[PDB]
Each structure stands twice: as C-alpha cells, then as structure tokens.
C-alpha cells in the first residue's frame, strides 16, 4: 500500500504532462497552417 | 513485484514523453522562428 501510493501519484503527473503536450502540440499545428497561408499570400504578391 | 515492475514502466514513460516535450517546444520555438522572419517580408514586400 505504500509502493502503489507512489505508483498512482506518479500516474497522476503522467497523465498530465502529456495533456500539457498535447495543448502545447495543438500550437505546432495552427502555426503550421498559418505559415502556409502566409507563403501563398507571399507567392501571390511577388509575382505581382 | 508486478506494481514495482509497473512503477518503472510508468516512470519510463513520464521521462520518455517529457523527453519528447524538450524536442517539442524546441520546434515550437522554430516556427516561431520561421514565422517571425517570414512575417517581416510580408510587410516589407506589401511596403515595396
């Protein structure tokens, strides 16, 4: 009972943390959707 | 000597994902990069 306390608050922070990675991946996303935006309004002006 | 065995697979992975984390936000201080100069020719070229 004293070994699975600090198995389960353990668990705990492992759950977490990729909760917290998860949030901060989300923002490798929408960059990355407005950097292509970004390009294709760069493309669409240098030709002009 | 299952849960000790368990506690170091959830211990293997809270340093594994975290690990990940570290090669993650570093990226997500690339496209900052990669943003912040790409911006600066956006208004630079809607300038010229």
Same mark, same amino acid.
């Given at each position: 009972?004293?070994? &699975?306390?600090?198995?389960?608050? %353990? @668990?705990? @922070?492992?759950?977490?943390? @990729?909760?917290?990675? +998860? &949030?901060?991946?989300?923002? %490798?996303? +929408?960059? +990355? /959707?407005?950097?292509?935006?970004? /390009?294709? &309004?760069? /493309? +669409? %002006? %240098?030709? @002009?």
């Amino acid at each position: 009972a004293a070994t &699975e306390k600090i198995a389960k608050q %353990l @668990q705990h @922070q492992v759950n977490e943390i @990729q909760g917290k990675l +998860d &949030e901060a991946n989300r923002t %490798l996303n +929408d960059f +990355d /959707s407005a950097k292509k935006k970004l /390009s294709i &309004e760069n /493309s +669409d %002006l %240098l030709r @002009q």
